Amino acid sequence: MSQWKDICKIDDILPETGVCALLGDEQVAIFRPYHSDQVFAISNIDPFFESSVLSRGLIAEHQGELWVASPLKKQRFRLSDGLCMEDEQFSVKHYEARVKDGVVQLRGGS
């Protein structure tokens, strides 16, 4: 069972930028961390500290991996899957994101 919900065209999401989408009641943070068709989706809200939007953060590398840093504090979420370096005990919600016909689609409910 997979609900690939159309969000928007990838043209709307600027190079290395993150935006918030809605998968039912799930606020998903769609991060396009490159210029290519490579996009990743995680929870736009964290459950520990509670940052209402993680899409209000800057993408920065470390270890050769892409981390989104929330300027609210020092929260860094690894975009590869969803390893928050602060939450690495539990790890955050990850959704699958694909660029279909230039349109960003999210799959969840796994």
Curated annotation (Swiss-Prot):
MF terms in GO: 2 iron, 2 sulfur cluster binding; nitrite reductase NADH activity
Entry EC number(s): 1.7.1.15
Catalytic activity entry: NH4(+) + 3 NAD(+) + 2 H2O = nitrite + 3 NADH + 5 H(+)
GO cellular component term, pick one: nitrite reductase complex [NAD(P)H]
Example GO biological process: nitrate assimilation
Residue ranges of the TM segments: none
Keywords for the protein's UniProt record, in alphabetical order: Cytoplasm, NAD, Nitrate assimilation, Oxidoreductase
InterPro entries: NirD, Rieske-like_NirD, Rieske_2Fe-2S_sf
Root EC class: oxidoreductase
Superkingdom: Bacteria
Localization per Swiss-Prot or TrEMBL: Cytoplasm
Family: To B.subtilis NasE.
Described purpose of this protein according to its UniProt entry: Required for activity of the reductase.
Database matches in NCBIfam families: nirD_assim_sml, PRK09511.1
Subunit structure: Associates with NirB.
Protein name: Nitrite reductase (NADH) small subunit
Taxonomic path: Bacteria, Pseudomonadati, Pseudomonadota, Gammaproteobacteria, Enterobacterales
Gene name linked to the record: nirD
